[PDB]
Amino acid sequence: CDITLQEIIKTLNSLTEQKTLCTELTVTDIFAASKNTTEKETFCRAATVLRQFYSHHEKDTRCLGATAQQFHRHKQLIRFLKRLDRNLWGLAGLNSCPVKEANQSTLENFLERLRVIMQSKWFKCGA
Amino acid sequence: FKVLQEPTCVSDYMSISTCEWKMNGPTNCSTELRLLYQLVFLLSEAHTCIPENNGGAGCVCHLLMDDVVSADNYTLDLWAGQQLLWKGSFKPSEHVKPRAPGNLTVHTNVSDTLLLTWSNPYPPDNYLYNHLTYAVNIWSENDPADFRIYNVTYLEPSLRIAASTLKSGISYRARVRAWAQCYNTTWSEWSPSTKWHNS
Amino acid sequence: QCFVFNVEYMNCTWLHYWYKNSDNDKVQKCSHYLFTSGCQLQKKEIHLYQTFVVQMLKLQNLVIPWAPENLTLHKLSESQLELNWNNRFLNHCLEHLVQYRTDWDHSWTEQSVDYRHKFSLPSVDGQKRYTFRVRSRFNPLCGSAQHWSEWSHPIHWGSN
Amino acid sequence: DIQVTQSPSSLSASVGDRVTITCRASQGISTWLAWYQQRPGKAPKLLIYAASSLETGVPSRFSGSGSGTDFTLTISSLQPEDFATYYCQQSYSTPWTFGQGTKVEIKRTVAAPSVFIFPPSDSQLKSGTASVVCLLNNFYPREAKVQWKVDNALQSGNSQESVTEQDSKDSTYSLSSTLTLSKADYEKHKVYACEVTHQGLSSPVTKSFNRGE
Amino acid sequence: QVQLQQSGPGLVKPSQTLSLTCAISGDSVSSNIATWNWIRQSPSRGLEWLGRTYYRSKWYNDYAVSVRSRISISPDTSKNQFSLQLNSVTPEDTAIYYCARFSGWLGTGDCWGQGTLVTVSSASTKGPSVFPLAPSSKSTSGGTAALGCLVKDYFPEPVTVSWNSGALTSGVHTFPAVLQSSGLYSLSSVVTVPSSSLGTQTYICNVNHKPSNTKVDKKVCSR
Ligand SMILES: *[C@@H]1O[C@H](CO[C@@H]2O[C@@H](C)[C@@H](O)[C@@H](O)[C@@H]2O)[C@@H](O)[C@H](O)[C@H]1NC(C)=O
Ligand SMILES: *[C@@H]1O[C@H](CO)[C@@H](O)[C@H](O)[C@H]1NC(C)=O
Ligand SMILES: *[C@@H]1O[C@H](CO)[C@@H](O)[C@H](O)[C@H]1NC(C)=O
Ligand SMILES: *[C@@H]1O[C@H](CO)[C@@H](O)[C@H](O)[C@H]1NC(C)=O
Ligand SMILES: *[C@@H]1O[C@H](CO)[C@@H](O)[C@H](O)[C@H]1NC(C)=O
Ligand SMILES: *[C@@H]1O[C@H](CO)[C@@H](O)[C@H](O)[C@H]1NC(C)=O
Structure with a gap:
């Protein structure tokens, strides 16, 4: 298998535990409209959805916090989202993967559904 | 100027990578050489490193990594003035x-x-x-x-x-x-x- | 209150179930009631990483494996002392917890072990009696279970 | 200098018995004591280190105990291969000092010696020397008596005996008395005999040969 | 796994210098977790520790008081060896010498060398004489036949007697050497074999006397 698959899972386990203010926003649920695509197409699309999020909401003043710990969480979330983007992108290997029309999903449910797929891939990835 | 042994790098997998290489003849690393490195990715920025002398013909360069994941792959370009001397890649997760x-x-x-x-x-x-x-x-x-x-x-x-x-x-x-x-x-x-x- | 046991069967205590948003979305029947205490499912009626609804819950966070078996001991070096064991479920999904003490100790001391590592004591007093026991947890690469398995049958080492 | 004294010098025990060897140090050395085994013709082998810890590959019937100045090596269920000499050694400070040794002899049932006798080869006779060899094989205990008969005459001061170390499988011995004569004294006689007197023999056995048969 | 090979046994004239070497396989002489020792054994001395050499951040040497005035142990990091030297030797220095790998922190000999017998004598080396032993005339008790070889008149010890290039080990009995009146040593090596293979199976005793570079291989035929 890969060490990369473990870094991805270790990040999702930390994300689904610690949720913030802008984790309630919506993104494109590429899993609900997965018309039986290959495994690498799902990785490439999962990275683009995450990439489009922290690019849109890193400097989003609404996503910042009032307290210092609330500011730490937002910077910590964006940091973890960048780690998933780069690990999911290199694991896929696809240059471009057009994200077709699909229904929406909040960021938390996109990550929780993503963590389930990753833990399942690692389950079958047992030597 | 010529590259004797190829630059080899190691990473602490958090913030700093380090690269070493020996030269053909004795060189002032800080004056003659520049090492450009950048993460191969959509969103990334190029960085420049000034080498320090480690010996007579041995240069060492400290690299700056904001964050490192296993898939990250960096492009190294060793420049003497305006003429390229050596080019290579470096995956920090494979040289921790x-x-x-x-x-x-x-x-x-x-x-x-x-x-x-x-x-x-x-x-x-x-x-x-x-x-x-x-x-x-x-x-x-x-x-x-x-x-x-x-x-x-x-x-x-x-x-x-x-x-x-x-x-x-x-x-x-x-x-x-x-x-x-x-x-x-x-x-x-x-x-x-x-x-x-x-x- | 369902619980999966080493990817074999389920035990729920206090009906019909279906897989949410996936294939085979038909409500089934509890083939084997428990006395009405609860229900139980076979190994074929268990699809991990599928949104399991009866009350909805995730299955990979509810797995409790069997206690390890075949605990061995042999000196890896002049001072080392490695402890081995076997697991029933997939060895690449389990997080083991090794616990040991001496017969003069009034409390157990414990150390955690990865799936890819093997436990070993770097320093051992040859004139003391040691006792080891290991329990495992389905965590965290294949699931997020918080419950361990039972303690394995203890093993011993040394004299005096 | 840490001095070490080991006891006893030797001991005989049967297969299955519980053998105990002791070692007393000159000063308190905590648990820094090692035990070695030296089988015949072989270098010492480490058995126990740090007073009580078995070296890998050493059978579980070897035990070491003690702390301070009095230590103990214990063999439960003694085995024929455990025949050797056992040394202790303090490991506290240099110079390393060893015990005097302890010869562990195995005690078995009485065995009878198969008696053989060999005539001098023609290749040896060219050198003007004849060495007749009488061979006792696989007997117990070690005590035996060999007497040479050169034409029904008992010689003396003309032979040498060589006993083997106790065998490490059947715990038996073997002996060879070699009668050496000049080529003239040997040719001046015909029938040589070797008379053995062992406890395992009801009557003395005498193997003989005639010169030129 | 570690393996220690020592130099050959031999003779040393009195007041001369004894020198032995130890070839290390599977470990480094400059290992900082081990120490490399020399031990000798003899009746008049017992198991006597001579000294050690070991490397940590630099080379260290430690000797016993009984030999400190005459001893020198040196490492050889190019051939991965270490050697022992004793000068002004007396007959009391006649013994079996071992090299051994002691563990550094608990001072215990994990691995030992086979051992080298060094004799201190004014006498000179003499090769042996290998004579066969007739198998069947007044022997062959029961179904097992007993034959052997007679290694006679050599100096000094030891002699290495093997059978069929080391393939025959069962029933072999090599007797301890006997110090004859003439001053030379002599031993015997008998071996019991099935009598049904006397004419078929050929039997060779491989006598080897290293102090004289003697290597004899006498055949024992039925006579
Ligand atoms: C490298 O050079 C430093 C500054 O020297 C300057 O650069 C050279 C090329 C000349 O133009 C000279 O006139 C300049 O002052 C030194 O401070 C430094 O020690 C040098 N290091 C080595 C390793 O040579
Ligand atoms: C990094 O990328 C370059 C070009 O994109 C490639 O030549 C090199 O092989 C890559 N490095 C690794 C370790 O794959
Ligand atoms: C680990 O890295 C070393 C170089 O540091 C290399 O020689 C070795 O083959 C690698 N082992 C594996 C299993 O990749
Ligand atoms: C599950 O329930 C059955 C019947 O109630 C019982 O026999 C079995 O022991 C239970 N399993 C566990 C792991 O407790
Ligand atoms: C520790 O591990 C190394 C290899 O990683 C091994 O060479 C060494 O012998 C080990 N030490 C002990 C005391 O087990
Ligand atoms: C050092 O370790 C101790 C426990 O091992 C811990 O209590 C302490 O806070 C640590 N100190 C620092 C500066 O991290």
Whole structure:
């Protein structure tokens, strides 16, 4: 298998535990409209959805916090989202993967559904 | 100018990478050479490193990594003035050299054992946190022949040695290095030493 | 209150179930009631990583494996002492917890072990009696279970 | 200098018995004591280190105990291969000092010696020397009596005996008395005899040969 | 796994210098977790520790008081060896010498060399004489036949007697050497074999006397 698959899972386990203010926003649920695509197409699309999020909401003043710990969480979330983007992108290997029309999903449910797929891939990835 | 041996790099998998290379003839690294490095990715920015002389024809460059994941791949470009000398790639996850442990302390709580504890050098946010196995090195100040290396293969950073395997009245020194089997890393540098004189 | 046991069967205590948003979305029947204490499912009626609804819950966070078996001990070096064991479920999914003490100790001391690592004591007092026991947890690469398995049958080492 | 005294010098025990060897140090050395085994013709082998810890590959019937100045090596269920000499050694400080040794002899049932006798070869006779060899094989105990008969005459001060170390499988011995004569004294006689007197023999056995048969 | 090979046994004239070497395989002489020792054994001395050399951040040497005025142990990091030297030897220095790898911190000999017998004598070396032993005339008790070889008149010890290039080990009995009146040593090596293979199976005793570079291989036929 890969060490990369473990870094991805270790990040999702930390994300689904610690949720913030802008984790309630919506993104494109590429899993609900997965018309039986290959495994690498799902990785490439999962990275683009995450990439489009922290690019849109890193400097989003609404996503910042009032307290210092609330500011730490937002910077910590964006940091973890960048780690998933780069690990999911290199694991896929696809240059471009057009994200077709699909229904929406909040960021938390996109990550929780993503963590389930990753833990399942690692389950079958047992030597 | 010519490149003798090719630049080899190591990473601490957190913030700093380091690259070394030997040159054809003696060179002032800071004056003649520049090393450009950039992460191969959609969102990334190029960085420039000024080499430091390590010897006569040996240059060393410290690289700056905001964050490192296993898939990250960097492009290295070694420039002398306006003419390229060497070009290469570097995947930090494949050349990890962990940071040394610290906060090494000796506990004489138990009378039957001697407890040694140190600090895991990486924060829990780092991928290497749950993969570092250590190796504790104890030696006698009085008997140089007493030079032991204990292998810690569990996740916790501690060591319990039997108090009967130490001698009464002599002072020992300890130091610990770390490595990550999961990433097939080299050894960390030895931590600074601690001293105790048990009776 | 369902619980999966080493990817074999389920035990729920206090009906019909279906897989949410996936294939085979038909409500079934509890083939084997428990006395009405609860229900139980076979190994074929268990699809991990599928949104399991009866009350909805995730299955990979509810797995409790069997206690390890075949605990061995042999000196890896002049001072080392490695402890081995076997697990029923997939060895690449389990997080083991090793616990040991001496007959003079008034409390157990414990150390955690990865799936890829093997536990070993770097220093052992040869004139003391040791006792080891290991329990495992389905965590965290294949699931997020918080419950361990039972303690394995203890093993011993040494004299005096 | 840490001195070490080991006891006893030797002891005989049967297969299955519980053998105990002791070692007393000159000063307190905590648990820094090692035990070695030296089988015949072989270098010493480490059995126990740090007073009580078995070296890998050493059978579980070897035990070491003690702390301070009095230590003990214990063999439960003694085995024929455990025949050797056992040394202790303090490991506290240099110079390393060893015990005087302890010869562990195996005690078995009485065995009878198969008696053989060999005539001098023609290749040896060219050198003007004849060495007749009488061979006792696989007997117990070690005590035996060999007498040479050169034409029904008992010689003396003309032979040499060589006993083997106790065998490490059947715990038996073997002996060879070699009668050496000049080529003239040998040719001046015909029938040589070797008379053995062992406890395992009801009557003395005498193997003989005639010169030129 | 570690393996220690020592130099050959031999003779040393009195007041001359004894020198032995130890070839290390599977470990480094400059290992900082081990120490490399020399031990001798003899009736008048017992198991006597001579000294050691070991490397930590530099080379260290430690000797016993009984030999400190005459001893020198040196490492050889190019051939991965270490050697022992005793000068002004007396007959009391006649013994079996071992090299051994002691563990550094608990001072215990993990691995030992086979051992080398050094004799201190004014006498000179003499090769042996290998004579066969007739198998069947007044022997062959029961179904097992007993034959052997007679290694006679050599100096000094030892002699290495093997059978069929080391393939025959069962029933072999090599007797301890006997110090004859003439001053030379002599031993015997008998071996019991099935009588049904006397004419078929050929039997060779491989006598080897290293102090004289003697290597004899006498055949034993039925006579
Ligand atoms: C490298 O050079 C530094 C500054 O020297 C300057 O650069 C050279 C090329 C000349 O133009 C000279 O006139 C300049 O002052 C030194 O401070 C430094 O020690 C040098 N290092 C080495 C390793 O040569
Ligand atoms: C990094 O990328 C470059 C070009 O994109 C490629 O040539 C090189 O092989 C890559 N490095 C690794 C370790 O794959
Ligand atoms: C050093 O370690 C001890 C326990 O091992 C811990 O209580 C202490 O806070 C640590 N110190 C630092 C500065 O991390
Ligand atoms: C520790 O591990 C190294 C290999 O990583 C091995 O060479 C060494 O012998 C080990 N030491 C002990 C005391 O087990
Ligand atoms: C680990 O890395 C070393 C170089 O540091 C290399 O020689 C070795 O083959 C690697 N092992 C594996 C299993 O990749
Ligand atoms: C599950 O329930 C059955 C019947 O109630 C019982 O026999 C079995 O022991 C239970 N399993 C566990 C692991 O407790």
